Each structure stands twice: as structure tokens, then as C-alpha cells.
Design a binder for these strands. Structure first.
Lengths: 67, 80, 81, 198, 89
RNA sequence: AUGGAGAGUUUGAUCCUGGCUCAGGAUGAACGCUGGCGGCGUGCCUAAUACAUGCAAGUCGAGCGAACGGACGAGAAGCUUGCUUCUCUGAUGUUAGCGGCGGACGGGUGAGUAACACGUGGAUAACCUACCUAUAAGACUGGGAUAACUUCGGGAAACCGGAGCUAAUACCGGAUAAUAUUUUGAACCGCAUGGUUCAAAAGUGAAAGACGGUCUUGCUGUCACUUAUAGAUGGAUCCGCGCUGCAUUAGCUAGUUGGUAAGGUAACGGCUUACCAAGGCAACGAUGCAUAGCCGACCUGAGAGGGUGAUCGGCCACACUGGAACUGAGACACGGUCCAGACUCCUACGGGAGGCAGCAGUAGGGAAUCUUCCGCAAUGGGCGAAAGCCUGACGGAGCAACGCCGCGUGAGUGAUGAAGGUCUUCGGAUCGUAAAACUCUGUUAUUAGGGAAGAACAUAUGUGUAAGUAACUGUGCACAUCUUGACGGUACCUAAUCAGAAAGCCACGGCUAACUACGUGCCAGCAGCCGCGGUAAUACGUAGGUGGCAAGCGUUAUCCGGAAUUAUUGGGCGUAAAGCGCGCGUAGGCGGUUUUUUAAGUCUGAUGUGAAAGCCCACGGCUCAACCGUGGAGGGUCAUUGGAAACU
């Protein structure tokens, strides 16, 4: 993170853009049925882009209004 | 005006005109409301080494006469 | 960034401290020997004291010395005399 | 605000009273694709919600104006369940609707919006002015004759109690605070107050 | 030097002034000595000067100076006219 | 007394203990999606990290020398008979200096400080206080000096280092008076001690400017002057209590604790320095380490209580870091000096300079927090007789849905199947009085006219009146003429036109009101909890519905509540977590009956105080509301004063 500590962070959604060295905005919140990861990633903040086709729960997962 | 008029009990008459009284009163506790005794050694200025150990002494405050004594003697209610 | 008033105040405080320490050392000298002249029962035990008590409130009606250190000095002379 | 159909809201709730009745056309249970079906019975938190909606969509408000006019009914000595009823009909939406200047509530709210009132003097163009007991409500002198105004006075009679009305430039008076009898008791106020207790 | 001033209260584009005897080195909306009365220019017609004139003369006799607007406030009521009769006697 | 609810989860099924997870509120919030406005607020919480540039403290010619500018008396006339050559009465204007005052306030910040820093209540017979106000007494007589200017040298510079002149409300000498001080008497107190007459000796000031009338004068009004008293103010020191986490910090001190002297401080004092004495503090938590400006207040809670210190007020501390003094009433000083240090800048390399935790702004840090704006018109501040100037205090404008409160985004009708898109036991139930299209409104949008409160002054010049004078100016007061407005052609008000352009956002198993159908088939994925997905998914992904509420919605972070899961109110220890393996005992806590008694605890009533703002209540002003103002619960914490005497 900004402070020099390591975490593991989940990615919600379907598709992501997260090869390596990308700047992402870590959101708090534990995801259970997964060991050792208790943080999310804000989908659509700095360098990750939104999901490819959501139109239903659209604000989280971060995509803009189609058409 | 007038100054504070505490009464106490001497603890250690050391040399050179100083005695230390022990004013004891009862502060109450904040949350539980139980009374509890606590002590306060007030240094005071004896004139000519009059009061001895064991006495109960009435005192009065005055201007700072030294670094730690602020009080003076007025009257001795009982002695030993 | 000196404001153009403070560059004039540093000038007039050097001009005004030279007049002070000339007068303020003269008051401390004239009581250094008059307190000596109170001792030894010398000749000018009523003349240097009249000079010393003079200068320690020439410098007290001006704000060299305070008007309670003036009365403290002139009581340390005139009691012992 | 709402801007939608009061017909559908009168289906799910009791009535919104656009005309004298609105639920007789379709099924009076629920609007869409699950209305004409077996009505599953409803819990306590639902029914404390539905009567609140039947009062909110009656006067055509929204929350934190419906809520901010709730706890200021908790200031007077009366019953809090009906102090909230009596100062809710003392707005310039109900008073324009009660002493009839409109065939319905929304254009009565639209009448006090655009500035056709001049209550007690100059103008109050807000639709949430709680009217104090004893000052007159008129129509603007610039617009005294419209097709909306006069041709809805003659249809709807029964100016309710603690009010007056006249034809001399349509001047109501708002005599005093109305009673629970002179207030629509189709929605019971005795269960809305437990919704805001939680 | 102590001087009778105007400490402004009220909101934006709606000034309300309370009149105050206070020291000249305190801030405007800050610490005060005594609050004499009020002043309101933006009312209906009047300025609505309220002054307890028995107390405003306790300060004018020992060094309080009105500053160019409360000197108009005190003259509007008549404290400054009545101030001469203490000096005349 | 308007004051208190819950649910899910251990099991095949119960009861209990017990944690966990939700439903409610808030924020200096951030982020994602979306986004007509209006009114009041709020907006670097991180790096007390470094700062480009403007710019925040100046003012006074009525303190006075100089200067500079230039009208106005302005010659002879170069004859171009008006160009001034210079000469001038120099009116009057401007400033670089000397000098007075202000720079110690306003403004910022919270690093340090667990402390008489702060809060509250006291004390000073141990205190200082410029301006302001009041009362008296005065203002006499002389002197020399130095910036400016002229000249020289160093330096491209900017500034140093010399030489000679000049003025003052600058400085200095001498007279004249004190209730100061030191010697001697007579009251009262709370220990030193005070207050109020006395009476003797020494001591100490100073300013003139701009007016008035009349005597070639000599008194004189305005406000500077200094002397002594008071008052008002601001400040200082001392004291009782109230002040975070650790004992896996138990010995701290050595000018430390007293004494007697001496100095010195506004002032008392181990405040400092000499000698003499061995004290001082500490389990009631000395010390040490760590953390933190404190409070009013704010948020939450039925209360008890918990949490926070943004904004707004009070106080303290700090001004690149660490010491120090000067000037002055006031500083050991935020846009002052000196020294030391770390950085940074200019350079002709000879030596010079700078400190945004002022206002905007930049870089950097960061999830995150704005314009290098306008104005002194209002209120306040400084300097002035005053006009007035200076005021990044303040009043406004700009940006941001950051919050709160208001309005919108249009309804009156009416095919209760027009189109088409879901579902379908396809005939139909839905979206749906939804919707085309008929009739009107214009909050608002825009253009086009009108338009303001804030704004009362000071100042001049007139009239009285009051004090004072020989008299008049002048001054104090009274009125009445005219004067100025950043916002702003803004608020707002009249007309003209148009249903135009102005909705999204998250949930749909059960808590929790709102579901069917396709896709997908332990995959892709959801998840606050329990848990959903393996071919008939109401929990995934989409589509039609519906609902919560709305210019917002949702997620995350943190805080309080729910949590009676720190329980004084209000919990426990046989087996669920919990009785030391038992003695002897220190400190502490607690303690049988009666009488007399005192008043510490206790109760009761007299004050005083706990500022203002806000919270609660009642009115007033905002077109309503937010908000703003005024009057009240009221200070209930505490201290001072009477009483009561059962209980400790």
C-alpha cells in the first residue's frame, strides 16, 4: 500500500486488468471462505477498469451508464 | 479578606523552624461514591521551634516563605 | 523580508542603548563607591551619598531603572549611613 | 418528488383519492405480475410501513420532510400520534385542497407552487407553509379567473370544518386546527408512530 | 484603553450588532468586559437601539470612549446629552 | 419525571452460558454511479515538510530641518512684445531622512508540556500597569551634539568605512514641589505587619506646535507635555481541589529540604551565591518511560456514563533548530537584532540575503480538502486636530452535492388492450389512465424593463446651549442641511414565450416491506449473518416487474448505542471462564449496646459565582424551513454564611 506493508486483496467482478505494477485502491472488507485475504479492490478507481457488461448492480463494480 | 484556616497533625519536626502538619479529609470517589481518607503534608513555618511531634496544630496560609512551605502557625489545640 | 519600519527601529535602538549604558553604568559606579564611603567613616559620607541618591532617580524618572529598584538602592545606602 | 401515477400507489396502499375511486379497473391488490395472485399475509414491520406510505403519498411528501415534520409534532401537549395528523393538514397543500380550489391534490400543490395564493398578505409560494389558525387564504389578483380555478370550485363541495370559504375572490380563513374527525381516518395514526420508534 | 464598540453577530447579509464596552486590544468577536445593549440596522424601519443608560454612564465616567458609531447610538437615545450634567455639576 | 423495545448463529432436537454478526444514529469523511437550482454553513485531519512570486504594519508638515515641484509680485528685453534667461514674495504640493507613537494587538499553528498548563474556587498586610478618564500642582533658565546634505575610499552592484556643516516635542546641564525613601510619636491584625496625621534631613521634572482677539503686546482656547493621587484596564505570582496508560517502572533527589546572611526581582521565594544543619518526596503510586495543549462545547446514551477537541469563543505554548540580551509601560519579540547550527539563494567570487505553523498559490505526502480574486462601503485596529491613509483582521466574490434546509424535474383529463417488451396452463393477465393528443399554469429556465435595504456617520458651515474667559475663536452637547457603498445592475418585482431541458441509485432466500422468466450448471461468480451455484437457481449474470427514497444513492473507514459482553445503578466464581494448596499477620477496609457532647461527613436556607455563543423552553426576523436575534429553566458541581443532631 502507501504504507510499506503487504496485504492480499480480492477482486470482485468478472474480468480485470491486473497484470503487475498497477495502481489500485484497496477497499476494506473481509471476504470469507478465503484464507489470508480480507480486503477488496475498488473496481474503477485508478488503473483497474470496470466490468465488461453489468447493468444491474452497476455503481459498485464501477461502470458508467450505457448509451 | 481572610486566608484559609486549616487544622492538622504534625509528622516530622526536623531542624530549623519548620514543621509539617497532616491535614486529612475525605474525598469521595467519582463513580462508586465511597468515601476515602487521603493525606496532604502541608509544610508550615514555626517561629522558634515551638511545636513538637504529636501535636495537633491549627495553621493559616501566608505568602511563600520558602520553596515548599507556604503556611504559618497560629495556634496549637493539643500537644503530646 | 524586512518591513521598512523595523529597519529604522534597529537603528534607533542602537542609538538609544548607547545613551542608556553610559547612564546606567554611571549609576552603578556612583553607588559602588558611595557604599564604600558609607563604610570606613570617610570624608564624603554625606556628599557621595547625596550624589548616589541623586543619580539613582535621575535614572528612575527616566525608564533606565524601575521606581522600586530605585527605592531599594537608596534604602541600602541611607540605612547603613 | 413523486411525479408518477397515483393509481398504482392506490392499488398497493388503500387509496390516493384522485377521483372518488381508482382501484376498480384492475386487481386492487398489487400492480405488476404478482398482483392477481394469492396475497401472502404480511408481518408487523410491513403493516407499520404501509400505513406510513398511505399517509406520505396522500399528502405527497417525502422522507426527511415527512420525518422532520414528525419530531416537531413531539413538542405540544396532545397525543403525538394525532399532533402529527393535525399539523399535516395545516400545510398550504391540504388547505388549498380542503377548501376546494382544485379537483385534486397535485394541481393544488402546483397552484401554491407558481404563486396563486397571497396568503395573509403578500405571498407564500411554498407548499409546506404550516398555516397558523386564523389568517386568510386567497387567490392572486393577477390571476383571479382561470379554467383550473373556478371550474373546480363548483364541482367539489364540502369545505371541511374549522374552515370558511366564499366567492368574493375565493377567501378561506382557516378558523382553527381541525380535529381527528375532520381529518381522513382511512389511515390509522395509531400504528405509524411505532414505525419511528424502531 | 477601554472603549465602547460594536461586536457583530448574525448571519451573512444580515448584520446584528451588540454594543459592548471592551478593551481596544481584544479581537472584535472575542472577549468582552460588559455588554450594554444591541443595534440592528436591517430591521423594518427603526435601528432598534436598546441601551440601559444607567450602566452605560458607569463606563463613560472612567475612560470608555465611544467610537464614531456608538457615539451616534448614544446620541440617538440621548446618553451623550445627559453625560454633560455630570461634568457640569 | 414525555424516559429503555430487537433479530440471526453451537445441536438430530432443547435449555443455559457465551462470543460473533446485523437492524439506529452521526462525520472536517473518502470512493463508485449519477447530477436543474436556491439559502445558510463548512472545506490539508497526512509532512510543526521545503517554499518561486505578490501581499499581510504602517502613520504623523499642526514635532523640523532640509530638499524637490510650482503658481504668484515677477524688471530691463533675446524684440520671437511674450518666451519667464535668471531674479524673486515664495502660496501650496510632494516625499528620502531625524523624531513621536504603533510594530507585544489582530492573524496562524498545536510541535513541546501530565504541568498550578488548564478548569473551578480562593489569596496578594509579597505585586506592576503606556495610552484612556478624573482631580490638583506646574511648565523656569542654559548648553553642546548627530542623520539628512557636501566631500572621500572600497564594491559592477546593495552597503560599509572616513572628513566637514544643520534643526527639533531629539539629547543634556542647572533651579523650583511631593503622600517615595530614613530617623522619632500617638490606632488595629491574621505572623512579618497597615492606615493617617505628624516633623527633621537629603533627593527629582519641563514642549513646543498650530489658533483667537487686541496693545509694537500679554493674557489666552484646542492637545500634546511631567509631577503626585485615585478609578478603569491589562498583566504577574501563590494556594485548595479536578487532570491519560503502565508496578513486565520501587527508591527518587544533593541547591535537593530547612536555617542565617548577602545580593536581585515589578514582587515573595533554594530565584541565585556563600557558610550551618540532614533533611525532602513516595503503594493516597515519588520517579521513569510512553501518549496527549486544556476547557466551554460537540456527538452518542433512558440515565449513569462513553467518545471527540474541525468550525465558533476563553487560556497556554510555539514562530527553520538551540541559547541570549537590547528597545520599551508591556517581548526575552511570527513579516526585530546578536550568536551557534542545519538547509537555501544572488554574485563581476569582492561578500551579500532569506525563514508562508499570515492570505491565496506551488512542489511533495496523501483516499482526500479550493481562487496566485474584489473592497476598505460595514464593524473593528493603528497613527493623526482633521480630511484621510494603511489594514489577505474583516465584509464580499469564485470552486467543491461536503453537510443541512427549502423548491423543482409539470397535472387536468380521459380507450379500463394504440405500437411493443416481458410473463403465459398463449385467451389473456401485466407495464397502465402509462402513453401518444386535447385544454391551462410558468415556481424555475432566458431576454427585458424596473430596482434596495445594508447607508449613520465623521468632516466641513450655519444655529443655539453648557463650561470657561476681560472678550472671541475653540471645545462639550443639541439639529440640519450634502457626502460616500466592494457586493451589484446582485437580491427582488413586473411583463413575453415553451409541457420545451431538469433522474437516477441500491436492494428482491430469511432477518428485511419489493419475483417471475431466460442464460450459466460447484464453472462464472455472490456473501453483513446463516450460507447460495453440480440441468426445473425466487441468493450468480441479464431482461420485465415491484420496493425502499430521491438530487442524491450505495460501499468503505471511525465513534457511541444495541452490549446488563466490565454490571455503582446493573453480572458472576459446585460442574459453563472464575475461590489463592492452606496458615500467621502489616497497611487498609469494616466493626456490639446506652448516655452526654461536637458538627468532619450528612441534611436544610441565605448569598456570591460556573463569561458570551449553544442545548431545552417562549416569542421576534428571515415568503416557510435551515438559520438569525431576544427573553427564560440556571448554573445543579464550587466557595462563603446561618441553622438541624438521628445516622457514620
Amino acid at each position: 500500500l502507501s504504507n510499506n506493508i503487504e496485504i492480499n486483496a480480492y477482486i470482485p467482478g468478472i474480468g480485470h486488468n491486473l497484470q503487475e505494477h498497477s495502481v489500485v485502491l484497496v477497499r476494506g472488507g473481509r471476504v470469507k471462505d478465503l484464507p489470508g485475504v480480507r480486503y477488496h479492490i475498488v473496481r474503477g478507481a485508478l488503473d483497474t477498469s470496470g466490468v465488461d457488461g453489468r447493468r444491474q448492480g452497476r455503481s459498485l463494480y464501477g461502470t458508467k451508464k450505457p448509451k | 479578606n481572610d486566608r484559609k484556616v486549616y487544622v492538622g497533625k504534625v509528622v516530622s519536626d526536623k531542624m530549623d523552624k519548620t514543621i509539617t502538619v497532616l491535614v486529612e479529609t475525605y474525598k469521595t470517589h467519582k463513580l462508586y461514591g465511597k468515601r476515602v481518607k487521603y493525606s496532604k503534608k502541608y509544610k508550615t513555618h514555626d517561629e522558634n521551634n515551638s511545636a513538637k511531634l504529636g501535636d495537633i496544630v491549627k495553621i493559616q496560609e501566608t505568602r511563600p516563605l520558602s520553596a515548599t512551605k507556604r503556611f504559618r502557625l497560629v495556634e496549637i489545640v493539643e500537644e503530646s | 523580508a524586512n518591513i521598512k519600519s523595523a529597519i529604522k527601529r534597529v537603528k534607533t535602538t542602537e542609538k538609544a542603548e548607547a545613551r542608556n549604558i553610559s547612564q546606567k553604568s554611571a549609576m552603578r559606579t556612583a553607588v559602588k563607591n558611595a557604599k564604600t564611603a558609607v563604610s570606613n567613616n570617610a570624608d564624603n559620607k554625606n556628599e557621595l551619598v547625596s550624589l548616589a541618591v541623586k543619580l539613582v532617580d535621575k535614572a528612575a524618572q527616566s525608564n533606565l531603572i524601575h521606581s522600586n529598584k530605585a527605592d531599594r538602592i537608596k534604602s541600602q545606602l541611607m540605612t547603613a549611613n | 418528488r413523486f411525479r408518477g401515477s397515483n393509481w398504482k400507489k392506490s392499488r398497493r396502499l388503500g387509496i390516493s383519492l384522485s377521483g372518488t375511486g381508482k382501484e376498480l379497473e384492475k386487481r386492487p391488490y398489487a400492480p405488476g405480475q404478482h398482483g392477481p395472485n394469492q396475497r401472502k399475509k404480511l408481518s408487523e414491520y410491513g403493516l407499520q410501513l404501509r400505513e406510513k406510505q398511505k399517509l406520505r403519498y396522500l399528502y405527497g411528501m417525502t422522507e426527511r420532510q415527512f420525518r422532520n415534520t414528525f419530531d416537531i409534532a413531539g413538542k405540544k401537549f396532545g397525543v403525538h400520534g394525532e399532533n402529527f395528523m393535525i399539523l399535516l393538514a395545516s400545510r398550504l397543500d391540504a388547505v388549498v385542497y380542503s377548501l376546494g380550489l382544485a379537483r385534486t391534490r397535485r394541481q393544488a400543490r402546483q397552484l401554491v407552487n407558481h404563486g396563486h395564493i397571497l396568503v395573509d398578505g403578500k405571498r407564500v409560494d411554498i407548499p409546506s407553509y404550516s398555516v397558523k389558525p386564523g389568517q386568510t387564504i386567497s387567490v392572486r389578483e393577477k390571476s383571479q379567473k382561470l379554467n383550473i380555478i373556478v371550474e373546480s370550485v363548483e364541482i367539489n363541495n364540502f369545505v371541511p370544518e374549522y374552515l370558511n370559504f366564499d366567492a368574493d375572490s375565493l377567501t378561506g380563513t382557516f378558523v382553527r386546527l381541525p380535529e381527528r374527525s375532520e381529518l381522513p381516518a382511512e389511515i390509522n395514526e395509531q400504528l405509524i408512530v411505532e414505525y419511528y420508534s424502531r | 484603553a477601554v472603549k465602547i464598540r460594536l461586536t457583530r453577530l448574525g448571519s451573512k447579509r444580515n448584520p446584528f450588532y451588540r454594543i459592548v464596552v471592551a478593551d481596544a486590544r481584544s479581537p472584535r468577536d472575542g472577549r468582552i468586559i460588559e455588554q450594554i445593549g444591541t443595534y440592528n440596522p436591517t430591521s423594518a424601519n427603526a435601528p432598534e437601539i436598546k441601551v440601559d443608560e444607567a450602566l452605560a454612564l458607569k463606563w463613560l465616567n472612567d475612560g470608555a470612549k465611544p467610537t464614531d458609531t456608538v457615539h451616534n447610538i448614544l446620541s440617538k437615545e440621548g446618553i451623550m446629552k445627559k453625560f454633560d450634567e455630570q461634568k457640569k455639576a
